[PDB]
């Protein structure tokens with residue numbers, strides 16, 4: 001196995017070949033391919049001519065677009081007091097004593113790392129446009145380069161292809177001084193452009209001055225957004241943005257592992273603390289800027305694997321991604337709801353019709369897809385079980401409206417997680433090992449987090465697939481034993497163990513059925529037996545079920561009547577809630593509030609549609625819901641869930657965090 005690395009300059013090619021020589025005997029070898037620009041590299045990689053290249057976030061964006069669709073597999077790590085993470089700070093450095101502020105940039109000369117790059121372009125230009133300093137309303141007001149050439153008197157923007165003015169301050173030969181790999185390119189080139197007097201300001205990163213003139217830091221200052229000027233070491237409190245680290249992108253195929261193994265071993269051997277003559281990263285320090293940031297930035301102290309569920313859009317984040325897109329586009333009162341499965345989509349489509357369109361619908365196969373869609377902005381909201389509200393929270397979404405189950409006029413609030421078993425049996429909370437279990441779904445409060453967290457806490461084990469002989473816990477690996485009792489849709493394809501209403505044993509009611517049809521214990525909520533007895537459920541399996549046919553399993557090992565859940569429950573837990581992106585909270589609460597007035601349990605038009613009712617399947621909202629109560633603005637997911645639940649799920653997630661949780665933890669720095 002050989003990794004074909006794509007370089008975009010002769011110096012990079014030289015370093016790459018140097019690394020090739022140093023790893024010729026390794027299990028995974030290295031090959032070097034030099035191209036004219038990073039874009040030729042993106043194309044080469046997509047075309048299976050090369051395998052990887054490290055890119056600035058602005059280029060990670062380009063590489064992730066169709067038809068390339070490359071993905072970030074490794075991210076640079078930079079030193080941080082708070083803790084080295086995979087992000088850096090874009091700063092605007094000027095020479096001390098020049099007095100002008102961020103508000104006086106019009107008419108000044110500027111130095112940039114390169115066109116389309118985070119710190120050197122996307123951040124500074126996007127910011128000046130946002131503040132209105134650079135007049136640009138969108139694509140129809142002309143190109144961004146034209147608006148920038150009109151703003152700054154002259155600049156050096158490696159890679160600029162429309163405005164000659166943006167190359168005017170660049171150093172070098174007439175035909176190549178404006179190339180993306182020219183003398184004044186990169187964070188270090190842009191800095192020297194400033195140092196040489198060719199720019200009044202250089203848009204670089206927080207380590208730049210230290211990398212090029214540590215002993216002369218005192219001759220520079222940072223331009224803060226509030227108009228102030230501060231010392232270069234104050235970047236944490238005087239920066240224009242915190243942006244995702246440069247990352248190695250590659251095709252979304254099997255070769256990603258070998259690419260990572262090569263890097264992992266390469267950095268173990270020539271990492272930041274290596275005594276070797278060869279440094280994978282830099283090392284940082286004074287030297288010809290043309291020799292800096294080769295292959296990887298000199299400021300990187302390590303590479304970190306990027307969770308597989310990550311794509312370029314998620315990697316960059318909604319705000320930055322949206323900023324880039326806005327500079328490529330021109331020139332609301334409807335909620336884009338996320339429905340999991342065909343059943344939820346049908347109820348949602350119906351809601352769309354009676355809401356006259358105030359609510360729109362998007363379908364996905366799994367709940368986790370809703371979290372991803374909302375993170376990207378493709379969808380606006382979704383109701384999630386507390387367990388998922390946690391994951392959604394780690395992902396940056398917040399709970400804005402929550403379900404209440406007691407009285408509709410009551411909109412604290414909660415429900416109880418219980419263990420249900422057949423009345424006539426010895427099954428108890430202490431002899432559960434080796435038994436058949438039924439779970440609403442993995443990751444959910446009552447069906448998984450509470451029961452399993454309780455077992456993990458007391459036992460210390462994480463191997464849950466072997467604790468129960470077998471059972472059904474939707475969302476588990478298809479061939480796992482916790483999927484053996486699941487039934488799928490009964491159609492084709494089977495869709496067995498899928499975490500949606502398509503799975504016969506999915507949800508609170510689904511797990512009860514599984515108990516009646518195949519299990520020894522069901523992990524549901526306090527009202528589940530109630531909701532499906534007394535003929536309230538006309539399904540063949542439950543049309544004749546009786547409340548007294550079941551019993552609750554208390555933690556002490558004893559058993560009780562299903563109506564004494566308050567004295568025999570695994571835990572009292574936070575209710576399900578509607579999560580959204582913070583900026584959307586305002587609109588979603590308002591639109592959701594007007595909807596409940598028309599279609600709530602006492603809706604003025606409840607005869608047309610009822611938000612809180614479904615065929616015993618908790619579609620979109622729990623069937624138990626009596627009303628939604630507003631979650632105070634600014635409430636974090638931890639505050640909403642309560643410290644008790646938070647502590648439980650926090651610990652349990654150390655066992656086997658899902659792909660999405662790992663992905664969002666990465667985004668959070670973990």
Ligand SMILES: [Al+3]
Nearest residue numbers: 056057118119
């Ligand atoms: Al950068």
Ligand SMILES: [Al+3]
Nearest residue numbers: 385386445446
């Ligand atoms: Al629940």
